[PDB]
Structure 1
Amino acid sequence: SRKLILFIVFLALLLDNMLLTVVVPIIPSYLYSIKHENVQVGLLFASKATVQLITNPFIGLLTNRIGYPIPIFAGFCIMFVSTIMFAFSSSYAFLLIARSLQGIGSSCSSVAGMGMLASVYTDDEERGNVMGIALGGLAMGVLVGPPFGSVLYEFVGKTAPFLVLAALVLLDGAIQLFVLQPSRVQPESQKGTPLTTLLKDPYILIAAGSICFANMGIAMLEPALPIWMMETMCSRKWQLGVAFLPASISYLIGTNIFGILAHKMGRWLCALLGMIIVGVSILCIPFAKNIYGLIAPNFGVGFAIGMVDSSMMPIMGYLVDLRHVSVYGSVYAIADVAFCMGYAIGPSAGGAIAKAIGFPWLMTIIGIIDILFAPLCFFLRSPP
């Protein structure tokens, strides 16, 4: 009965991404009103992703000393605290602190949950399936966040989305306490291989780079696309919001189905095809003239990112099992660092490049990089 661990990881990722995507619509207007009585949003997101990026190696090393359950419960506690502060804080410094705490909790939950899933599902196929489900939960939380927040804001109040999220967080924490039971400290049997040896592995580097570039695609998509839309198509705000819906839906479907299909098609082949597809979709994005012209490339981008994630995340554990000690804190900390590497420079830089050179040139460069990195996944195939 280890499906409870999968449910806990699923819930943690879902609620974390739900908070990360639900805070967005409300705070900036209140910040502007407070200042009186676009860029700072990207600064908030960069802060959260950067704090998650810094914490990842530390949590990876910590999971080898105190085990997984205590980091998971700590992630839950920090995530609850950040949700409460989001509910009650109205200034900018407190909201920045809330974002940083949410980043720490994101690092804890993601790294420890992936490590626990890898350590529990030792089969190479079941591992792929369960982390495909976990990434599908991440995508589900991303997709549900904004509609849930808008509905609760219109129905009850501004604090309602965060209070309901905090109630769900308390339910998840009660489940964790009942199942995980982080009463004592349980060190792992074998000392983990240091990251200095892990970053020296070309295959782990290749998988991490594939994840990093695949996520960098959408990471620089998010803040630069609305400006280009308003400049060329003069599109409306609802059209801007709808634009990323195909990406989220395709990401959810891709994660859920390719967590299973990667082991059938071949993880290396799935990653190569995903990189090619995301490169082609990003190349085709600038040529669109209407939102209907971006419905298909966004779907391709989401599907390809789901392919790459749900293929490379299992391959990380497979590689660390094959050529390293069977401990998954450090390698999945590396994978989280790969995620945050794109998600942290996205908001901060994407605008800068989209202003220095044209948005079509930026997206052409990103797509060319992804296409050229696609053949590097050829080296991740198994000899037998």
Structure 2
Amino acid sequence: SRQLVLVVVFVALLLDNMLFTVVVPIVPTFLYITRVGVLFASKAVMQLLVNPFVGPLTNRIGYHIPMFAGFVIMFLSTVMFAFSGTYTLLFVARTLQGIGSSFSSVAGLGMLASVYTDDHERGRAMGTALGGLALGLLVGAPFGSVMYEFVGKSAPFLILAFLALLDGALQLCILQPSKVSPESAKGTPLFMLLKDPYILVAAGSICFANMGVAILEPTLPIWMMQTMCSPKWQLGLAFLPASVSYLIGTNLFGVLANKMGRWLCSLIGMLVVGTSLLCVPLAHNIFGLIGPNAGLGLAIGMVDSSMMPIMGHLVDLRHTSVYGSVYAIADVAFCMGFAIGPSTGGAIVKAIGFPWLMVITGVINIVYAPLCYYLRSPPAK
């Protein structure tokens, strides 16, 4: 094992989100705005479409085979990135990274849900898994930055590949993905899960918080150059507090959510993220963003740790104990924000403006915040 498959998911999410973030400081320097924006969103769009095809499959194949597929797909994704020097290869490698990320994330979260049956222990495990994901997001970009600065471009991809082989050796050691074991219980269909307001409310809260982070992610530096006229070295330093607060919140609230009540934690988290998004566009220097960005990260960790086990609790309370479809919906809500963010952020900012855009983000978060009371006590079947 119960605790044995926790490091396999921790390591698997650590490297996958490492490849997601390490690509940032190395790609646009090689090619030298809207043309590169579609490249960053290739992972989100393709992985969004492949998400509905991974959920229903898990009822018969199992979780081990998707995890091994995520390992191998990350292997090709890092090896192609290490050697690619053209857009036509970079887009294909990024799409492979996206599909591998979707496979590995869905399989890992499903395996974590299936391994732990107690509610509090499952919440703690999901908190530590999201902590590993936040740690990977924190360590990705500076790692590639220093590698491309002193050592070279292909070196970080090779190092991530070596770590990937080590992770795959771990998977072969513990999981043993050699046989197809179908789950005895037949999972509920994915379309029927969209007719349950509990799952829709939880997925909407997760998607709205992740959209609130993924909109501020790509368009913040453009506003920084347009208004503050700041040096380039602290562009990642501005978003560093968001990652650090994300890691701290997801590591600390995994035990606190059970005691404080999940619905109250989700409500307070979305209120905090709405207030932080409101307060972000009023800063006039880099020092004013450490507060609101840290609050945004803490609120996102609040919502994630509160509503990741709430999907499993709802599925156990109402439907059968097959966790693939609900967490597939959760991953879709996770990744549609990253699909919407970098492609359309510049267009929306040029159309309406950045402070207005954060106004709608905070307003929608605050207005949908009272809807989290519905999850206080979903009646059983």
Q: TM-score if structure 2 supplies the norm length?
A: 0.97
Could you tell me how far apart the structure 1 residues matched to 2:226 and 2:66 are? Answer: 46
What residue identity is the alignment partner of 1:24?
V
Could you tell me how far apart the structure 2 residues matched to 1:77 and 1:88 are? Answer: 17
Q: Does 1:307 align with 2:302?
A: yes
SS in 2 for 1:270: helix
- The Cα of 1:229 is off from its aligned counterpart by 1.1
Could you tell me how far apart the structure 2 residues matched to 1:335 and 1:75 are? Answer: 18
Structure 1 residue runs of 4+, over 3 Å off? none
8 Å contact from structure 2 (residues 267, 372) kept in 1? yes
Residue in 1 that maps onto 2:331: 336
SS in 2 for 1:5: coil
SS in 2 for 1:238: coil
| 1:356 alignment partner, one of 351, 364, 370 | 351
Give runs of aligned pairs for residues 105-254 of structure 1, distance below 5 A.
Answer: 105-254=100-249
Q: TM-score if structure 1 supplies the norm length?
A: 0.97
- The Cα of 1:218 is off from its aligned counterpart by 1.1
Percent identity over paired residues? 76
Could you tell me how far apart the structure 1 residues matched to 2:57 and 2:150 are? Answer: 42
User: Comparing 111-120 with 152-161, which one deviates more in the overlay?
Assistant: 152-161
Could you tell me how far apart the structure 1 residues matched to 2:189 and 2:218 are? Answer: 36
- The Cα of 1:351 is off from its aligned counterpart by 1.2
Q: Does 1:376 align with 2:363?
A: no
Could you tell me how far apart the structure 2 residues matched to 1:127 and 1:221 are? Answer: 30
Could you tell me how far apart the structure 1 residues matched to 2:366 and 2:207 are? Answer: 14
CA distances 1:259-297 after superposition (whole Å, capped 9, x unpaired): 221111111000000000000000011111111111100
SS in 2 for 1:3: coil
Could you tell me how far apart the structure 2 residues matched to 1:130 and 1:222 are? Answer: 27
8 Å contact from structure 2 (residues 61, 181) kept in 1? yes
8 Å contact from structure 2 (residues 198, 374) kept in 1? yes
What residue identity is the alignment partner of 1:185?
V
User: Comparing 65-74 with 20-29, which one deviates more in the overlay?
Assistant: 20-29
SS in 2 for 1:185: coil
Could you tell me how far apart the structure 2 residues matched to 1:63 and 1:287 are? Answer: 46
Unmatched runs of 5 consecutive residues or more in structure 2: none
Could you tell me how far apart the structure 2 residues matched to 1:300 and 1:16 are? Answer: 25
- The Cα of 1:58 is off from its aligned counterpart by 1.0
Cα RMSD after superposing both structures: 1.2
CA distances 1:2-45 after superposition (whole Å, capped 9, x unpaired): 2221100111111011111111111222223xxxxx32332122
Could you tell me how far apart the structure 2 residues matched to 1:338 and 1:277 are? Answer: 20
Unmatched runs of 5 consecutive residues or more in structure 1: 33-37
Residue in 2 that maps onto 1:35: none
- The Cα of 1:154 is off from its aligned counterpart by 3.2
| 2:97 alignment partner, one of 97, 102, 105 | 102
Residue in 2 that maps onto 1:18: 18
Could you tell me how far apart the structure 1 residues matched to 2:205 and 2:378 are? Answer: 20
Q: Does 1:317 align with 2:317?
A: no
Q: Does 1:281 align with 2:251?
A: no
Q: Does 1:83 align with 2:83?
A: no
| 1:65 alignment partner, one of 60, 63, 66 | 60
What residue identity is the alignment partner of 2:319?
H
CA distances 1:89-147 after superposition (whole Å, capped 9, x unpaired): 11111111111111111111110111100000011111100011000000000000012
